[PDB]
């Protein structure tokens, strides 16, 4: 139909957004790791629990059900898997 032209144009927008998300996830990851290297070079902990929980609950308030999962990906990329 005509809907294929609209869908293909909506998909190119999703592509541009997925690139944005990804570039920004990458940048965020770089900065989270620096904070960890700075805190650990001063004799602090790798993780800060109240800061993680806050970001996690913040994401849920924003997007619902998937918020904790989304946040969890950023926390894991940023401070590493636990263990």
């Amino acid at each position: 139909p005509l809907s294929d032209a609209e869908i293909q144009k909506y998909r190119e927008e999703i592509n541009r957004l997925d690139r944005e998300i990804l570039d920004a996830v990458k940048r965020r990851t770089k900065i989270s790791q620096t904070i960890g290297k700075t805190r650990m070079s001063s004799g602090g902990t790798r993780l800060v629990h109240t800061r993680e929980v806050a970001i996690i609950n913040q994401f849920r308030e924003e997007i619902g059900e998937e918020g904790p999962a989304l946040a969890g990906i950023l926390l894991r990329m940023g401070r590493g898997k636990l263990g």
């Binding site: 993780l47 629990h49 993680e52 636990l82």
Partner: protein, 457 residues
């Protein structure tokens, strides 16, 4: 038929154990009470004929499980009160701690993909070590309920040998109930998981755990979906342990045991597992030499002044027959020392051919005294020691064998941080520990989920 003749005629203290004992009894013994030698001896004679707290065959079974931990096939979860008291040795409290440990263990089993051996600080943990003998006022320090009382009076603080008898009574009441609970439904896997879902549902930090928790629930429904019966899932074994500290009590509970073959061993049957404290671990002293001559599995606390040479020397003294899981090395280094000190300890010990259990104690190296004069520990520092412990093991290729934590199933305000965000001013609300600050129920469950992820990596 030379074996036919022989078979008819043949039909129709021991050895150097007494050597090693007198040697051990001769040695200096840190952290002991000052009480009448005659009174103390009379109490030891009473305690020498009473029923032990555990039987030897239980200890031989633990030894096989600890071998599995050491060989990379299982995980050790140890914990409970810093110090039991006779006032707190009550059904509801013992039950609160048993549940808490059992709850932590289901989560850890799921994350470890291995059995978890459940060892409680219980049924004997009545002796604590102290830096000085007297308080600021020349009042004798509280030394745990097996020595004296908490009350700050001279009567209460007097060192009383008869408290060894009260301690044995309370310990056996306690072990009795631990056995009854774990065999009558408290250790039911499905009941335990119902309590964990309530924890997640009601936690202010539940969103941190919900996904791991949904995963575990789907693992449990799967078990049942595959037609797996009730069988092993309705009960579990909890093992008791305490610091082997008070010489008179631990000697009075020595028992001989003869096994399947006819082999004769000396056991300290006040507990399944015993450990040697940081302040009592001189290689020439009573405690280390006592553990070296009893058959019980043994733990030893090592702080951040430990050198690898010293680690090897303990391993040689305590695991001389190269038995996996005979010895657990309990690293309590501080969250900022763990990454620095432990690698070289592990390397020398691994290279020397001992297969010890490597256990993290993230509590005793992370204690500080807050503005308001409360001894406390921060959740994040506790977590970060454990996390550092795991990082070391992943770097070396060795097995993170277990944890040793101080917690209670009560809603106390003793350690800072966690989901409830406990701060300096919250500490005096409900601080009930007779000694060190324990993780509360909520903090214990949070830690089990976090250590689950450490295992999963």
């Amino acid at each position: 038929h030379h074996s036919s003749g022989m078979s008819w005629t043949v039909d129709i203290l021991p050895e150097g154990m007494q050597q090693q004992f007198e040697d051990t009894i001769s040695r200096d013994a840190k952290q002991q009470p000052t009480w009448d030698r005659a009174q103390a001896e009379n109490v030891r004679k009473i305690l020498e004929s009473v029923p032990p707290i555990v039987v030897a065959p239980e200890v031989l079974e633990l030894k096989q499980k600890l071998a599995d931990v050491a060989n990379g096939k299982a995980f050790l979860l140890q914990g409970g009160d810093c110090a039991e008291t006779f006032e707190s040795n009550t059904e509801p409290h013992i039950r609160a701690n048993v549940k808490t440990l059992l709850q932590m263990a289901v989560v850890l089993t799921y994350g470890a993909s291995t059995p978890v051996i459940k060892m409680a600080r219980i049924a004997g943990q009545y002796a604590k070590p102290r830096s000085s003998d007297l308080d600021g006022n020349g009042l004798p320090n509280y030394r745990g309920d097996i020595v004296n009382g908490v009350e700050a009076t001279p009567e209460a603080r007097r060192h009383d040998p008869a408290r060894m008898i009260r301690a044995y009574a309370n310990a056996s009441a306690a072990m009795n109930l631990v056995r009854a609970l774990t065999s009558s439904g408290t250790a039911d896997l499905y009941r335990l998981s119902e309590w964990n879902r309530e924890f997640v549902a009601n936690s202010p930090a539940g969103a941190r755990y919900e996904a791991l928790a949904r995963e575990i629930d789907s693992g449990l429904r799967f078990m049942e979906a595959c037609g797996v019966s009730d069988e092993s899932l309705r009960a579990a074994d909890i093992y008791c342990s305490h610091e082997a500290l008070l010489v008179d009590y631990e000697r009075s509970m020595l028992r001989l045991a003869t096994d399947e073959e006819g082999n004769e061993e000396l056991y300290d049957l006040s507990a399944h597992q015993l450990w040697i404290g940081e302040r009592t671990r001189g290689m020439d002293d009573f405690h280390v030499n006592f553990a070296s001559m009893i058959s019980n599995p043994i733990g030893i606390k090592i702080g951040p002044g430990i050198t690898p040479e010293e680690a090897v020397a303990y391993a040689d003294k305590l695991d001389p027959n190269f038995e996996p899981g005979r010895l657990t090395i309990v690293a309590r280094m501080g969250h900022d020392k763990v990454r620095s000190v432990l690698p070289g300890v592990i390397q020398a010990v691994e290279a020397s051919g001992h297969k010890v259990i490597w256990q993290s104690d993230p509590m005793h190296g992370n204690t500080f005294t807050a503005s308001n004069g409360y001894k406390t520990r921060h959740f994040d520092k506790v977590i970060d020691e454990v996390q550092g412990f795991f990082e070391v093991h992943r770097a070396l290729g060795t097995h993170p064998g277990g944890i040793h934590i101080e917690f209670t199933g009560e809603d106390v305000t003793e350690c800072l941080g966690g989901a409830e965000d406990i701060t300096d001013v919250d500490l005096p609300g409900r601080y009930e520990s007779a000694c060190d600050p324990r993780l509360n129920t909520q903090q214990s469950l949070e830690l089990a989920f976090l250590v689950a992820e450490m295992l999963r990596n």
